[PDB]
Amino acid sequence: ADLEDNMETLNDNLKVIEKADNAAQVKDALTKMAAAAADAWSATPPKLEDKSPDSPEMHDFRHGFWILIGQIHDALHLANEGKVKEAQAAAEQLKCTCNACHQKYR
Amino acid sequence: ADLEDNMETLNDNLKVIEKADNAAQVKDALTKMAAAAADAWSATPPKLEDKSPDSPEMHDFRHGFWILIGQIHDALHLANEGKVKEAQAAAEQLKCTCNACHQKYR
Amino acid sequence: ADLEDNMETLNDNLKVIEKADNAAQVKDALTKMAAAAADAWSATPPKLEDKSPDSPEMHDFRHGFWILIGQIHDALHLANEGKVKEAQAAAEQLKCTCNACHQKYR
Amino acid sequence: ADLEDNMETLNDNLKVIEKADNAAQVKDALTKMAAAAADAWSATPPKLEDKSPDSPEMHDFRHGFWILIGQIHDALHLANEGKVKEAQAAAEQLKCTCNACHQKYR
Numbered sequence: 174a175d176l177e178d179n180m181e182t183l184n185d186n187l188k189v190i191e192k193a194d195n196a197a198q199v200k201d202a203l204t205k206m207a208a209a210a211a212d213a214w215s216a217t218p219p220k221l222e223d224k225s226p227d228s229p230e231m232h233d234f235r236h237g238f239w240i241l242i243g244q245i246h247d248a249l250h251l252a253n254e255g256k257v258k259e260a261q262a263a264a265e266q267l268k269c270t271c272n273a274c275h276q277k278y279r
Numbered sequence: 280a281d282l283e284d285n286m287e288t289l290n291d292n293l294k295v296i297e298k299a300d301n302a303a304q305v306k307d308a309l310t311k312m313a314a315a316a317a318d319a320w321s322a323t324p325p326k327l328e329d330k331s332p333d334s335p336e337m338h339d340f341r342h343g344f345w346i347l348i349g350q351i352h353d354a355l356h357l358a359n360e361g362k363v364k365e366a367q368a369a370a371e372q373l374k375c376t377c378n379a380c381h382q383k384y385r
Numbered sequence: 386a387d388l389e390d391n392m393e394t395l396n397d398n399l400k401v402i403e404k405a406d407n408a409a410q411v412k413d414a415l416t417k418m419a420a421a422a423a424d425a426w427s428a429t430p431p432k433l434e435d436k437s438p439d440s441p442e443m444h445d446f447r448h449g450f451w452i453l454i455g456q457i458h459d460a461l462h463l464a465n466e467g468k469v470k471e472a473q474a475a476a477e478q479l480k481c482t483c484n485a486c487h488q489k490y491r
Numbered sequence: 492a493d494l495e496d497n498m499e500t501l502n503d504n505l506k507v508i509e510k511a512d513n514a515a516q517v518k519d520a521l522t523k524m525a526a527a528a529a530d531a532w533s534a535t536p537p538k539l540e541d542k543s544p545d546s547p548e549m550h551d552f553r554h555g556f557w558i559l560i561g562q563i564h565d566a567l568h569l570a571n572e573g574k575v576k577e578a579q580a581a582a583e584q585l586k587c588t589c590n591a592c593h594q595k596y597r
C-alpha cells in the first residue's frame with residue numbers, strides 16, 4: 174500500500190479504538206494498525222523525496238515509525254489481556270507520535 | 280504546589296517560549312517548567328481521587344509527567360546549546376503530551 | 386546518599402528481585418530502587434567532574450537515569466498487578482541500562 | 492530462516508564489526524544483522540512453544556527484537572556517517588540486548 178493508504182488505515186482504526194467497547198474490536202484494529210505502520214516504515218515521503226535515503230531526515234522519519242510500532246504493539250498486548258480502557262488510553266498518547274512526525278514531514 | 284498552580288506555571292512558560300527572542304529566555308522558562316513538572320509528578324488529580332494510588336490510571340498519570348519531564352530536559356539541552364529555533368520546535372511538540380493527559384484525566 | 390551508596394542500593398535490590406518468589410518483596414525492592422535512581426539522577430560522576438554541568442556528557446548521564454527510572458516504574462506497576470514473573474523479566478532488560486551507562490562513565 | 496540460522500548471522504556479523512577497519516565493513520555487517528533481526532522477530536523459540544502467541548512471554552520476546560532492531564538501525568546510522576568508533580561502541584552496547592533475551596528465553 175501507498176503511504177496515504179497506510180495513513181488512512183492508521184486514522185480509521187484509531188477511530189475504531191476510541192469507540193470500541195470490547196477488547197475483541199480493539200485487538201483487531203491495533204493488529205491492523207501494526208500492519209499499516211510496518212508498511213509505511215519504508216516509504217519515502219513527498220517532502221523528503223530529495224533527500225539521501227540515509228539522510229538524517231529519513232533516519233528520523235523511519236525512527237518515528239519504529240516508535241509508533243512499539244507503541245501499537247504495547248497497546249495490542251493490553252487489549253489481549255482484555256484491558257480495553259488501558260488499551261484505549263495507550264492509543265491517545267500514541268497520537269503524539271503521529272503528530273510529531275506530521276509536524277516535521279507532512 | 281497545587282496541581283492548578285503547577286499547571287499555570289507550565290502554561291505561562293510555554294507561552295514565554297513561543298514568543299522568545301533568545302536562549303536565556305527559553306532556558307529560564309524551560310527550567311521553571313521542569314520544576315513544575317517535577318512537583319506535579321506526584322499529585323493526585325480530582326478525577327482519580329477515588330482510584331488506588333497504584334491503579335493503571337494513576338500509573339499512566341505519573342507516566343505522562345515522566346514523558347513531559349524528558350521532553351523539557353531535552354528542550355532545555357537544545358536551549359543550552361543556543362539552539363533557539365530547535366528548542367522552540369521541541370516545546371511546541373511536547374504540547375501534545377500536555378493534551379494527551381488532559382484528554383484522559385482532566 | 387552518595388552515588389556509590391545509591392549504586393549499591395540498586396545492585397542489592399536488583400538481586401532481591403531475581404530471587405523473590407512473591408510480589409510483595411518485588412514491589413518493596415523496586416520502590417526502593419526508584420528512590421535510589423531518583424537520587425543519583427543529579428549526581429556528578431568522578432569521570433565527568435571536569436565537564437560542564439550542561440555538557441553533552443552530563444545530559445547523556447542524566448538521560449540514563451531518566452530511562453532507568455521509567456523502567457523501574459514500569460516494573461513496579463507489573464509487580465503491583467501481582468505479575469512477579471513479568472516484573473522479574475523487566476528487571477533483566479533494565480540491567481542493560483545500568484550497563485550502558487557504566488560502559489560510558491564508570 | 493531458522494532462529495538458529497538468524498542467530499548465527501547476528502553473532503558472526505557482530506564479530507566482523509568488532510574487528511572492522513572501515514565503515515563499508517561495519518555498514519555491510521549491520522545491514523545483514525538488521526535483516527536477520529527482522530526475520531527472527533516473528534519466531535517462536537523452543538522454550539515458549541507451548542505458550543500462547545499472545546502470552547506476556549511471547550510479547551516480551553518480540554519486544555526484545557524490537558529493541559535490537561532499533562539498536563542496529565542507530566548503529567547503522569553512525570556507520571553511514573563514517574562514525575566507525577561510534578558505530579562499534581554501539582554494536583558492543585547492543586550485546587546486552589542479545590544477552591537479556593538469552594537469559595530469559597534461551
Ligand code: HEM
Pocket residue numbers: 176177178180181183184187218219220233234235236237238241267268270271272274275278279
Ligand atoms: C497512528 C498515527 C498516525 C495517524 C493516525 C496518521 C494519519 C495520517 C493521515 C490521516 C494523513 C492524511 C493524508 C492521507 O492519508 O490521505 C497522514 C499523512 C502523513 N503522515 Fe501520518 N499518521 C500517523 C502517523 C505517522 C508517522 C509516525 C509518520 C512519520 C514517521 C507519518 C507521516 C506522514 C506523512 C509524510 C504524511 C503525508 C503523506 C502524503 O504526502 O500524502 N504519519 N497521516
Ligand code: HEM
Pocket residue numbers: 282283284285286287289290293324325340341342343344347373374376377378380381384385
Ligand atoms: C506542558 C504541558 C502542560 C501544560 C501547558 C498544561 C496546562 C494546563 C492548564 C492551563 C490547565 C488549566 C488551568 C490550571 O489548572 O492551572 C491544566 C489542568 C490540568 N492538567 Fe495540565 N498542562 C500540562 C501538562 C499536563 C500533564 C502531562 C498532565 C498529566 C500527566 C496534566 C494534567 C492536568 C490536570 C489533571 C488538570 C486538571 C487539574 C484540576 O482540575 O485541578 N497536565 N493544565
Ligand code: HEM
Pocket residue numbers: 388389390392393395396399430431432445446447448449450453479480482483484486487490491
Ligand atoms: C539498576 C542499574 C544499576 C545498577 C545495578 C548499578 C550498580 C552499580 C554498582 C554495583 C557500582 C559499583 C561501585 C559502588 O557502588 O561501590 C556502580 C557504579 C557506577 N554506576 Fe551504576 N548501577 C546501575 C545504574 C547506573 C546508571 C543508569 C548510571 C548512569 C546513568 C550509573 C553510573 C554509575 C557510575 C558513574 C558509577 C561509578 C561511581 C563511582 O565513581 O564510584 N549506574 N553502579
Ligand code: HEM
Pocket residue numbers: 494495496497498499501502505536537552553554555556559585586588589590592593596597
Ligand atoms: C545481537 C544479539 C544477538 C546475538 C549476537 C545472538 C547470538 C546467538 C547465538 C550465537 C546463539 C546460539 C547459536 C545459534 O543458535 O545459532 C543464539 C541463540 C538464541 N538466541 Fe540469540 N543472539 C542475539 C539476540 C537475540 C535476541 C534479542 C533474542 C530474543 C528477543 C534471542 C534469542 C535467542 C534464542 C531463543 C536462542 C535459542 C535458539 C534455539 O534454541 O534454537 N537472541 N543467539
